Structure 1
């Protein structure tokens, strides 16, 4: 019912008298490929607990994506921190062209053809957050005319 894929897994270290102590962080995307996505970042002393926690957090943070024939309705450009994500809809038969992080996010969202570009900071976390805010800032023509009723 819900597909779950990890973006990256990293091991961080804090200094304590005696040595360094490790804490694992993991990004996880979850999607039904129908228009709903979710991003989560979990931290835990071990890796599997971090992956499970990231899955829970991702299921708790969902985003409804207005797909229009496997693609996006309009091009977007989002700055998260120093990271920039540029999205642009594509005709069918194009395929998803993106870095690993935005490719995973968009594929789990149900996108089939789109063009992207990562700019500035290539940080996977910030790129993921920028992609999420881009999908959150998407508007359909119905939404546009709904906002301009008056």
Structure 2
């Protein structure tokens, strides 16, 4: 109880935050019908470092930052080899949200649906195109991209895994 949380908020230049949806989810009780706020926060620096997080609380801002503290303990790093794009195409479903990611030329800003585009514009990739096949959901969507960019391999570690010395690569 020292006060004002100035040093303790950690001013968040390192991780920039945004919501991607704040739906009010509600439960009914004996007394009636009371609601809490479920916010989904995607945290990440533009270095290649993102992760989702849900939260719910009766306040809006405590749900956002509570989802952020859930989010900033959930980070993967993005395998993004070239001039801020992707090594190869990928698809990976989670639940019932399927996400096709596809690398792009460098003259192409990120084009995807709002959750996928949110976790990629926070991922610092600049050149991708990801269609979403399946759900209208936002959480399983974004988390499906996170699973869809964990399982993604560069050329250096595939060259290391196969044992092949090196060729067949322009750069």
TM-score (norm. length: structure 1): 0.95
Q: Which residue of 2 aligns with 1:77?
A: 91
Distance apart, 1:114 and its partner CA: 0.7
**Secondary structure of 1:31's partner?**
strand
Higher strand share: 1
TM-score (norm. length: structure 2): 0.84
RMSD of equivalent CA atoms: 1.3
Specify which of 45, 65, 69 is matched with residue 52 of structure 1.
65
Q: Which residue of 1 aligns with 2:47?
A: 34
**Secondary structure of 1:109's partner?**
coil
**In structure 2, C-alpha distance between the alignment counterparts of 1:76 and 1:145, rounded to whole Å:** 18
**In structure 2, C-alpha distance between the alignment counterparts of 1:25 and 1:32, rounded to whole Å:** 23
**In structure 2, C-alpha distance between the alignment counterparts of 1:138 and 1:42, rounded to whole Å:** 28
Specify which of 114, 127, 138 is matched with residue 100 of structure 1.
114
Over 2 Å off, 4+ runs: 145-149
Structure 1 regions of 5+ residues with no counterpart? Answer: none
**In structure 1, C-alpha distance between the alignment counterparts of 2:124 and 2:96, rounded to whole Å:** 27
Render the CA deviation track for 1:52-75: whole Å, top value 9, x for unaligned: 011111110001101121111110
Distance apart, 1:105 and its partner CA: 0.5
Higher helix share: 1
Q: Which residue of 2 aligns with 1:121?
A: 135
**In structure 2, C-alpha distance between the alignment counterparts of 1:24 and 1:147, rounded to whole Å:** 46
Name the larger-Rg structure: 2
